[PDB]
Amino acid sequence: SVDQKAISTIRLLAVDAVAAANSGHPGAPLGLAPAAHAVFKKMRFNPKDTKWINRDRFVLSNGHACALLYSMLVLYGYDLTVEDLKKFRQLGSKTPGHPENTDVPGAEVTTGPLGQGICNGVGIALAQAQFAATYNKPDFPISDSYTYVFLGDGCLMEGVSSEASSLAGHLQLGNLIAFWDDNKISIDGSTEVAFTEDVIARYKSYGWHIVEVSDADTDITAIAAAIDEAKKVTNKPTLVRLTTTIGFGSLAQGTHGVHGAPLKADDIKQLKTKWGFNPEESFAVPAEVTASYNEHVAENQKIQQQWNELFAAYKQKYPELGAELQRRLDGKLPENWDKALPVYTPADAAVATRKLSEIVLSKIIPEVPEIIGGSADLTPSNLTKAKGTVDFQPAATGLGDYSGRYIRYGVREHAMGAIMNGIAAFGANYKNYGGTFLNFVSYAAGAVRLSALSEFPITWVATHDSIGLGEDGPTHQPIETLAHFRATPNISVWRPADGNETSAAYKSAIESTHTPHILALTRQNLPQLEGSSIEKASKGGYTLVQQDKADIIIVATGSEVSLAVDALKVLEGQGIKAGVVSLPDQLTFDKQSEEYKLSVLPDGVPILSVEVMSTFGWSKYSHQQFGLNRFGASGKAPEIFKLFEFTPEGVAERAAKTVAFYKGKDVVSPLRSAF
Amino acid sequence: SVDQKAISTIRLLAVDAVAAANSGHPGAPLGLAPAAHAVFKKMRFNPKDTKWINRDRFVLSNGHACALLYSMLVLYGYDLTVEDLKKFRQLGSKTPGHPENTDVPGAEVTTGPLGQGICNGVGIALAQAQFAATYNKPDFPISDSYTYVFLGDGCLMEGVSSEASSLAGHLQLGNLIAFWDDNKISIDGSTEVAFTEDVIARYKSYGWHIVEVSDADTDITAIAAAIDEAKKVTNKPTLVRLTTTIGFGSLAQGTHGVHGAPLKADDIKQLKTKWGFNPEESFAVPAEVTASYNEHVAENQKIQQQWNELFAAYKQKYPELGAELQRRLDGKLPENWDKALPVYTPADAAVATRKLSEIVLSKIIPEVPEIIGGSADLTPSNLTKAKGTVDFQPAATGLGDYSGRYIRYGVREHAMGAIMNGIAAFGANYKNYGGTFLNFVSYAAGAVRLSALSEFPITWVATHDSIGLGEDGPTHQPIETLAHFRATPNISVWRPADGNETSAAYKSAIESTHTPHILALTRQNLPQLEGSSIEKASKGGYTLVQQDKADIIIVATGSEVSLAVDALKVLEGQGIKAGVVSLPDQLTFDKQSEEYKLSVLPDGVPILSVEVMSTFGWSKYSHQQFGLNRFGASGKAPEIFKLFEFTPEGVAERAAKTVAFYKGKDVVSPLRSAF
Ligand SMILES: CC1=[N+](Cc2cnc(C)nc2N)CS[C@H]1CCOP(=O)(O)OP(=O)(O)O
Ligand SMILES: CC1=[N+](Cc2cnc(C)nc2N)CS[C@H]1CCOP(=O)(O)OP(=O)(O)O
Ligand SMILES: [Ca+2]
Ligand SMILES: [Ca+2]
């Protein structure tokens, strides 16, 4: 049949792509081609408009199987061709070895690191539910799309998927339909060696619906029926168990050897002949398959055409909501939204930056409907919920509504991070955030790195940033954390010192379209600084205290800026004139012009950095570094600062030693380099 | 009764400790005191010998509840007193706000970061099973101890605990007995807001046995009976559901407010009077409670006395095994074990450092019985299994035996990391390792940081270290990873360049007693270097190519050392004389004498670092840094190196620019500093 021919085409495109690269993963593509065919036939999408907001989304969580995804995209006429498939895994191609949303049309997210994609799918589905609850009206199903996820045994072993699956079940996300490639093979061989749990029983325990397809190597009727069944269960996410043979059709089917290396040439020949293809030909695309797939595309395009008319009618019937929706689909924030950002003066009281963050959120959430967010069981500590908002929960629970704006993630940092990526991936200008203690952002490193690689504007509200948290002690006190994330490409790591800097950090985080943000915020109160403003802090680094005859400049962040200002006064009594630079975000600063940066960190003066955590990275901006390169301590925070000499006198002593060390030396800016 | 009085004593010590600190967590201690009393009465331990190898182990995974643990340790006469309890959460005390194994006698592991302790318990139990299988003989139950773990809702939400619980069920770890504090309250309030899964059904799906105790606020008979029942189920770990009231007895019992802040003074008064204590007194220890607990200690000490005689008889009956066991309990490796380390010459073939690692393991595993390890589903990629070894599996599976030495962790990096910590915590000189790709060590950051804080000699075999892995692309290629771990205190991060350096890295990792190791290893082949040796590489950094008239020194690691040597030849043709330093471990290097370090990185010569990942940290050792501060690419590895100019010519160009940049300048070693 044409469907059988399409499945064979998919299988053979994937195998031929792996063969041409002499690299990659043929096994799962062979096993999942029937399911991919069936799912894409049920999906609504436009290959010519990858951003249609009511499209169904597909996520390949087992991203190593991407030759399958690329084959589907090529067959459906996305902006990806057979010539691109021939360049699978080749430098610069549109067909990288794992899918990247920035590079691959039709890749919703970046997968490959196992477990992430299913969590991203949870976030896409969460966003769709929130979006539909916000905009849909009687006779106006603006949003009614599904989220389809393929995942394998490896994703099911990764703890992040357990976190997200528990939460998705709790949230009753009935438009999420996941498909488990139950092939009983991973890299180390049979799943009997390490993965003998009853997966189905576990998913039932989370509140998921289950459909089992016992012969998913051939039974596309049953796969389609499983989708239909899943769509009837509106209050549970569904897991479809696809019992498949890894590498189906290969001489090596059902073995670990077919997972992750190219097939032998003779194996490819026998695949082709038993499926009616020419064993001498590669990258064959039968025109009847193209015709069948084109029919589905044309039908989907007529569905989108009708959706566009529905949207036009919605704008007439609901003028305010329609204009809001249009603005969001255009990627634009509300005009002058930033006038809601709080502004402070040096006469205002000291405030912890976690509390300043609460105040910002309280002002901007009512002004910017596309902001949603939550916390990983730290709501009253991170201060992430605006008073008067309702939680995102299924209304059946009585605990919230899908129109709610605040997500109770539970103690699930890693899944929170990957769910945030999925919310961003949904689109519609969502600007979403997640709170935890800074030290436990590290639990989510796998997802955070993907936020950076995927260019998603997510925000971590990362409170209790240092030894300033005090008594909880060294298991809770960051040392390495900012260095880790600052060393990751494309992460803005804001460590605001005061009220104006906290508003600048949020302005950056909410305006972002391609860069994730981490906001490192204090437990403890900090003074409002003389010289701070949103305008200056928006440059990422700025001169707080200018001293034209400086003997030294002290560059600091966060809680240490006020310390530097106090040290400047001690130094004056020692006959040393200091300037102060505040560096609330190194990435934003780095992006400023060379001339601006040199105005902040000039030649001809020693520069000392002060920040109560690792000194890594700081030599970009300073000649000498005063940091904390050992673990912390359990005690009252002021006593810990005293112990480690992060006091005005301790900073002054090191500043004086720095001045002494450079006597008789020629000093150029740390910004200079040889290449 | 005296048991009731003991439970009240525990509760009130914990509340009084929190009160004195005006900080900490009274709720879970109040709820878990009956269970703690019951469990410690069943446990075999010696407060005067915390390292008795056949002790039962206790782990408080909900580490915020540590006022409970400290109260137990004080009451049982560990080296912790009421005076220490009065200093709970105070700087420098033996009672920090979360338990630290380095600081607290009777704390087996460092907990506080949720989810870790239960995984550590899995590792303690895994080690006990392996140890017993190795040493026990008929009439000689050298090892027969249990592992008791307390955990709460937060631990059950963290994905790492799902990973470890799936694996523990698979491994049939019948001497593991965990207790869930089922109190339905977390920081964000009721668990109904985020955690509605059927936990018991999930644990059954993993193959655990379940016992439910419906009134764990009072029913110590049922808690004791649950332990007895668990001990009869020898082929499943057991989860005991303790249905408790958080803060039991407090006016605020059953509320989130009792989780994490001191009780009100009037609340403490009413607690004391209803339990028969003096509301005017704090830190009361009734002598009858001390007497009862002392009776149990005395019985346990007689059990250990008899174990010592059993061990003496074992040494006579099994002379070889007895001497091996004695050596391990003394903390000593086999005499001259390191003579098994492979040694290479520059005439030997190029080899990937992952393969060199395989060869090391193949030589040392037969020589050092306390080495065990595994991989997170990457055995044929990391090359972590020695041929001829058997896997650690329950014999009932037919897939291995508990005497086996190789662990199939599955796709569970985070749990692998925390399980490794538990294996180390067991003691008996275990030197254990875990393989994954370097980029996915990041999934386990929560546990890795705890390896460092806990001072455990665990080893990550972290292969595929860079863009040198090629086609899998940027989702797999480390950039920030070494900077992250090097910025963490107390992590040795070895990046060996060749065969001799790989042997030095293992010598360090296996000899370690207090420092975790990460071995960053290549996919791709590297040449054997002229000038390398185990002796020199053991210094962490060394002069590979000495040039007395150097215009520049190039410092490099791993795959970039050979690149630097090739660049030296290009530079010679440009009239520039270079030296080369290899820096296989920055931590080990840092620990050398100042004079040694200056002999490697002298004054008076520009120093350029070369390493194909983040430049963070490198200014400790260099004036200029050539690194990779952007994400990678999917293609053949040599083409990626060419793209980023990590070629002999690209390094030479930057070296020449470095020489030019320092013309006319006075250059001092990067090792110099102002303070
Ligand atoms: C272990 C593995 N990798 C390394 C890998 C490890 N850890 C993380 C976080 N991401 C990864 N990418 C890549 S791939 C995988 C086997 C998957 O086994 P799985 O059953 O899902 O795939 P398959 O056999 O094809 O049915
Ligand atoms: C969310 C929380 N903390 C921050 C916290 C967050 N993430 C990680 C990895 N470790 C932590 N330490 C500390 S504590 C916890 C509530 C526990 O809730 P749980 O039900 O286990 O404790 P309890 O209410 O006392 O019954
Ligand atoms: Ca599989
Ligand atoms: Ca709880």
Side-chain angles (χ1 to χ4, degrees), chain A residues 11 14-15 18 23-31 64-65 67 246-248 257-263:
Chain A
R11 286 181 164 148
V15 159
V18 171
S23 179
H25 299 79
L30 283 164
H64 59 277
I246 195 176
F248 180 84
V258 84
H259 152 83
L263 303 185

PDB file of all heavy atoms in Angstrom, chain A residues 11 14-15 18 23-31 64-65 67 246-248 257-263:
ATOM      1  N   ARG A  11      12.130   4.624   6.636  1.00  0.00           N
ATOM      2  CA  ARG A  11      13.173   3.746   7.157  1.00  0.00           C
ATOM      3  C   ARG A  11      14.444   3.846   6.332  1.00  0.00           C
ATOM      4  O   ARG A  11      15.556   3.931   6.877  1.00  0.00           O
ATOM      5  CB  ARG A  11      12.668   2.303   7.167  1.00  0.00           C
ATOM      6  CG  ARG A  11      11.666   2.024   8.258  1.00  0.00           C
ATOM      7  CD  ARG A  11      11.178   0.610   8.283  1.00  0.00           C
ATOM      8  NE  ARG A  11      10.512   0.273   9.535  1.00  0.00           N
ATOM      9  CZ  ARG A  11       9.506  -0.589   9.659  1.00  0.00           C
ATOM     10  NH1 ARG A  11       8.937  -1.153   8.600  1.00  0.00           N
ATOM     11  NH2 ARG A  11       9.056  -0.883  10.862  1.00  0.00           N
ATOM     12  N   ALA A  14      16.365   7.167   6.497  1.00  0.00           N
ATOM     13  CA  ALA A  14      17.127   7.265   7.735  1.00  0.00           C
ATOM     14  C   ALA A  14      18.396   6.427   7.663  1.00  0.00           C
ATOM     15  O   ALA A  14      19.480   6.889   8.029  1.00  0.00           O
ATOM     16  CB  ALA A  14      16.250   6.846   8.911  1.00  0.00           C
ATOM     17  N   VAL A  15      18.279   5.196   7.171  1.00  0.00           N
ATOM     18  CA  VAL A  15      19.432   4.313   7.071  1.00  0.00           C
ATOM     19  C   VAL A  15      20.444   4.853   6.079  1.00  0.00           C
ATOM     20  O   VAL A  15      21.657   4.767   6.303  1.00  0.00           O
ATOM     21  CB  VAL A  15      18.946   2.900   6.699  1.00  0.00           C
ATOM     22  CG1 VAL A  15      20.048   2.068   6.085  1.00  0.00           C
ATOM     23  CG2 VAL A  15      18.276   2.232   7.887  1.00  0.00           C
ATOM     24  N   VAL A  18      22.395   7.794   7.696  1.00  0.00           N
ATOM     25  CA  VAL A  18      23.428   7.252   8.573  1.00  0.00           C
ATOM     26  C   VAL A  18      24.576   6.677   7.749  1.00  0.00           C
ATOM     27  O   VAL A  18      25.758   6.850   8.081  1.00  0.00           O
ATOM     28  CB  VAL A  18      22.803   6.215   9.521  1.00  0.00           C
ATOM     29  CG1 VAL A  18      23.878   5.471  10.305  1.00  0.00           C
ATOM     30  CG2 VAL A  18      21.811   6.863  10.462  1.00  0.00           C
ATOM     31  N   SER A  23      28.047   7.512  10.376  1.00  0.00           N
ATOM     32  CA  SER A  23      27.898   7.909  11.765  1.00  0.00           C
ATOM     33  C   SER A  23      26.412   8.032  12.045  1.00  0.00           C
ATOM     34  O   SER A  23      25.659   8.488  11.184  1.00  0.00           O
ATOM     35  CB  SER A  23      28.563   9.277  11.990  1.00  0.00           C
ATOM     36  OG  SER A  23      28.426   9.706  13.326  1.00  0.00           O
ATOM     37  N   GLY A  24      26.010   7.661  13.254  1.00  0.00           N
ATOM     38  CA  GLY A  24      24.653   7.877  13.709  1.00  0.00           C
ATOM     39  C   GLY A  24      23.919   6.595  14.016  1.00  0.00           C
ATOM     40  O   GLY A  24      24.502   5.515  14.137  1.00  0.00           O
ATOM     41  N   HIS A  25      22.601   6.741  14.158  1.00  0.00           N
ATOM     42  CA  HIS A  25      21.784   5.803  14.920  1.00  0.00           C
ATOM     43  C   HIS A  25      20.653   5.311  14.042  1.00  0.00           C
ATOM     44  O   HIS A  25      19.659   6.029  13.842  1.00  0.00           O
ATOM     45  CB  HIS A  25      21.222   6.489  16.154  1.00  0.00           C
ATOM     46  CG  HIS A  25      22.265   6.989  17.078  1.00  0.00           C
ATOM     47  ND1 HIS A  25      22.963   8.157  16.861  1.00  0.00           N
ATOM     48  CD2 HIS A  25      22.707   6.479  18.247  1.00  0.00           C
ATOM     49  CE1 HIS A  25      23.816   8.326  17.855  1.00  0.00           C
ATOM     50  NE2 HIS A  25      23.672   7.330  18.712  1.00  0.00           N
ATOM     51  N   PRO A  26      20.759   4.100  13.487  1.00  0.00           N
ATOM     52  CA  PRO A  26      19.703   3.600  12.596  1.00  0.00           C
ATOM     53  C   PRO A  26      18.616   2.813  13.316  1.00  0.00           C
ATOM     54  O   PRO A  26      17.537   2.619  12.748  1.00  0.00           O
ATOM     55  CB  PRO A  26      20.474   2.709  11.616  1.00  0.00           C
ATOM     56  CG  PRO A  26      21.577   2.142  12.471  1.00  0.00           C
ATOM     57  CD  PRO A  26      21.973   3.256  13.424  1.00  0.00           C
ATOM     58  N   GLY A  27      18.876   2.327  14.528  1.00  0.00           N
ATOM     59  CA  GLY A  27      17.999   1.354  15.146  1.00  0.00           C
ATOM     60  C   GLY A  27      16.628   1.895  15.498  1.00  0.00           C
ATOM     61  O   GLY A  27      15.605   1.327  15.094  1.00  0.00           O
ATOM     62  N   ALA A  28      16.599   2.976  16.273  1.00  0.00           N
ATOM     63  CA  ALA A  28      15.321   3.533  16.677  1.00  0.00           C
ATOM     64  C   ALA A  28      14.560   4.105  15.484  1.00  0.00           C
ATOM     65  O   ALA A  28      13.340   3.919  15.409  1.00  0.00           O
ATOM     66  CB  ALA A  28      15.476   4.513  17.837  1.00  0.00           C
ATOM     67  N   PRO A  29      15.214   4.737  14.500  1.00  0.00           N
ATOM     68  CA  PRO A  29      14.453   5.137  13.303  1.00  0.00           C
ATOM     69  C   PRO A  29      13.757   3.975  12.615  1.00  0.00           C
ATOM     70  O   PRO A  29      12.597   4.104  12.202  1.00  0.00           O
ATOM     71  CB  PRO A  29      15.514   5.815  12.435  1.00  0.00           C
ATOM     72  CG  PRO A  29      16.451   6.429  13.455  1.00  0.00           C
ATOM     73  CD  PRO A  29      16.544   5.381  14.544  1.00  0.00           C
ATOM     74  N   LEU A  30      14.444   2.835  12.476  1.00  0.00           N
ATOM     75  CA  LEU A  30      13.821   1.671  11.870  1.00  0.00           C
ATOM     76  C   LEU A  30      12.618   1.202  12.675  1.00  0.00           C
ATOM     77  O   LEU A  30      11.578   0.848  12.109  1.00  0.00           O
ATOM     78  CB  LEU A  30      14.842   0.553  11.700  1.00  0.00           C
ATOM     79  CG  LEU A  30      15.809   0.738  10.526  1.00  0.00           C
ATOM     80  CD1 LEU A  30      17.010  -0.190  10.675  1.00  0.00           C
ATOM     81  CD2 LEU A  30      15.099   0.490   9.206  1.00  0.00           C
ATOM     82  N   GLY A  31      12.754   1.181  14.002  1.00  0.00           N
ATOM     83  CA  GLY A  31      11.681   0.707  14.851  1.00  0.00           C
ATOM     84  C   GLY A  31      10.502   1.653  14.949  1.00  0.00           C
ATOM     85  O   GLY A  31       9.373   1.206  15.160  1.00  0.00           O
ATOM     86  N   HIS A  64      18.796  11.012  19.529  1.00  0.00           N
ATOM     87  CA  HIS A  64      19.725  10.273  18.692  1.00  0.00           C
ATOM     88  C   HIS A  64      19.029   9.668  17.482  1.00  0.00           C
ATOM     89  O   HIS A  64      19.693   9.393  16.479  1.00  0.00           O
ATOM     90  CB  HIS A  64      20.430   9.184  19.497  1.00  0.00           C
ATOM     91  CG  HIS A  64      19.520   8.187  20.109  1.00  0.00           C
ATOM     92  ND1 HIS A  64      18.870   8.402  21.307  1.00  0.00           N
ATOM     93  CD2 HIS A  64      19.171   6.949  19.685  1.00  0.00           C
ATOM     94  CE1 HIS A  64      18.175   7.311  21.593  1.00  0.00           C
ATOM     95  NE2 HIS A  64      18.343   6.418  20.629  1.00  0.00           N
ATOM     96  N   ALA A  65      17.716   9.463  17.552  1.00  0.00           N
ATOM     97  CA  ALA A  65      16.925   8.929  16.461  1.00  0.00           C
ATOM     98  C   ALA A  65      16.581   9.978  15.415  1.00  0.00           C
ATOM     99  O   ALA A  65      15.684   9.757  14.594  1.00  0.00           O
ATOM    100  CB  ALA A  65      15.656   8.277  17.004  1.00  0.00           C
ATOM    101  N   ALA A  67      17.633  10.936  12.563  1.00  0.00           N
ATOM    102  CA  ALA A  67      17.475  10.650  11.146  1.00  0.00           C
ATOM    103  C   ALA A  67      16.007  10.386  10.809  1.00  0.00           C
ATOM    104  O   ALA A  67      15.561  10.685   9.698  1.00  0.00           O
ATOM    105  CB  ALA A  67      18.369   9.480  10.737  1.00  0.00           C
ATOM    106  N   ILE A 246      13.994  -2.958  17.782  1.00  0.00           N
ATOM    107  CA  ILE A 246      14.993  -1.977  17.388  1.00  0.00           C
ATOM    108  C   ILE A 246      15.622  -2.442  16.076  1.00  0.00           C
ATOM    109  O   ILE A 246      15.914  -3.628  15.888  1.00  0.00           O
ATOM    110  CB  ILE A 246      16.027  -1.734  18.507  1.00  0.00           C
ATOM    111  CG1 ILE A 246      16.811  -0.452  18.211  1.00  0.00           C
ATOM    112  CG2 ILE A 246      16.957  -2.936  18.710  1.00  0.00           C
ATOM    113  CD1 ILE A 246      17.782  -0.061  19.278  1.00  0.00           C
ATOM    114  N   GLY A 247      15.817  -1.520  15.147  1.00  0.00           N
ATOM    115  CA  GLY A 247      16.403  -1.921  13.890  1.00  0.00           C
ATOM    116  C   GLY A 247      15.540  -2.812  13.034  1.00  0.00           C
ATOM    117  O   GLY A 247      16.083  -3.485  12.157  1.00  0.00           O
ATOM    118  N   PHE A 248      14.217  -2.777  13.216  1.00  0.00           N
ATOM    119  CA  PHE A 248      13.312  -3.654  12.496  1.00  0.00           C
ATOM    120  C   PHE A 248      13.682  -3.749  11.026  1.00  0.00           C
ATOM    121  O   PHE A 248      13.766  -2.737  10.314  1.00  0.00           O
ATOM    122  CB  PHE A 248      11.876  -3.149  12.609  1.00  0.00           C
ATOM    123  CG  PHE A 248      10.906  -4.026  11.887  1.00  0.00           C
ATOM    124  CD1 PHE A 248      10.394  -5.160  12.496  1.00  0.00           C
ATOM    125  CD2 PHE A 248      10.566  -3.768  10.571  1.00  0.00           C
ATOM    126  CE1 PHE A 248       9.505  -5.991  11.821  1.00  0.00           C
ATOM    127  CE2 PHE A 248       9.692  -4.602   9.896  1.00  0.00           C
ATOM    128  CZ  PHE A 248       9.156  -5.701  10.525  1.00  0.00           C
ATOM    129  N   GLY A 257      23.863  -3.644  18.766  1.00  0.00           N
ATOM    130  CA  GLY A 257      24.721  -3.178  17.701  1.00  0.00           C
ATOM    131  C   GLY A 257      24.022  -2.307  16.684  1.00  0.00           C
ATOM    132  O   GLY A 257      24.687  -1.533  16.001  1.00  0.00           O
ATOM    133  N   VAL A 258      22.696  -2.423  16.563  1.00  0.00           N
ATOM    134  CA  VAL A 258      21.926  -1.607  15.623  1.00  0.00           C
ATOM    135  C   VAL A 258      21.529  -0.264  16.218  1.00  0.00           C
ATOM    136  O   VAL A 258      21.010   0.601  15.497  1.00  0.00           O
ATOM    137  CB  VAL A 258      20.738  -2.449  15.094  1.00  0.00           C
ATOM    138  CG1 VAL A 258      19.559  -2.417  16.009  1.00  0.00           C
ATOM    139  CG2 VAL A 258      20.349  -2.115  13.675  1.00  0.00           C
ATOM    140  N   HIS A 259      21.769  -0.052  17.511  1.00  0.00           N
ATOM    141  CA  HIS A 259      21.374   1.201  18.139  1.00  0.00           C
ATOM    142  C   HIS A 259      22.121   2.395  17.551  1.00  0.00           C
ATOM    143  O   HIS A 259      21.514   3.436  17.265  1.00  0.00           O
ATOM    144  CB  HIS A 259      21.609   1.130  19.648  1.00  0.00           C
ATOM    145  CG  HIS A 259      21.882   2.467  20.254  1.00  0.00           C
ATOM    146  ND1 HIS A 259      20.878   3.337  20.610  1.00  0.00           N
ATOM    147  CD2 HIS A 259      23.048   3.108  20.518  1.00  0.00           C
ATOM    148  CE1 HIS A 259      21.410   4.449  21.080  1.00  0.00           C
ATOM    149  NE2 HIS A 259      22.725   4.343  21.019  1.00  0.00           N
ATOM    150  N   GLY A 260      23.443   2.266  17.381  1.00  0.00           N
ATOM    151  CA  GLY A 260      24.282   3.450  17.349  1.00  0.00           C
ATOM    152  C   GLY A 260      25.422   3.458  16.368  1.00  0.00           C
ATOM    153  O   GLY A 260      26.360   4.243  16.512  1.00  0.00           O
ATOM    154  N   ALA A 261      25.361   2.600  15.365  1.00  0.00           N
ATOM    155  CA  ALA A 261      26.392   2.575  14.347  1.00  0.00           C
ATOM    156  C   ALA A 261      25.743   2.296  13.006  1.00  0.00           C
ATOM    157  O   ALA A 261      24.696   1.641  12.942  1.00  0.00           O
ATOM    158  CB  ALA A 261      27.419   1.469  14.634  1.00  0.00           C
ATOM    159  N   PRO A 262      26.377   2.719  11.919  1.00  0.00           N
ATOM    160  CA  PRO A 262      25.833   2.438  10.590  1.00  0.00           C
ATOM    161  C   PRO A 262      25.675   0.949  10.335  1.00  0.00           C
ATOM    162  O   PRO A 262      26.471   0.126  10.795  1.00  0.00           O
ATOM    163  CB  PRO A 262      26.876   3.050   9.651  1.00  0.00           C
ATOM    164  CG  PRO A 262      27.535   4.116  10.462  1.00  0.00           C
ATOM    165  CD  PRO A 262      27.573   3.578  11.859  1.00  0.00           C
ATOM    166  N   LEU A 263      24.650   0.614   9.560  1.00  0.00           N
ATOM    167  CA  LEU A 263      24.449  -0.763   9.136  1.00  0.00           C
ATOM    168  C   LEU A 263      25.524  -1.174   8.135  1.00  0.00           C
ATOM    169  O   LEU A 263      26.132  -0.351   7.452  1.00  0.00           O
ATOM    170  CB  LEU A 263      23.079  -0.914   8.482  1.00  0.00           C
ATOM    171  CG  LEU A 263      21.880  -0.502   9.333  1.00  0.00           C
ATOM    172  CD1 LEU A 263      20.608  -0.827   8.576  1.00  0.00           C
ATOM    173  CD2 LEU A 263      21.889  -1.160  10.688  1.00  0.00           C
TER     174      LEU A 263
END
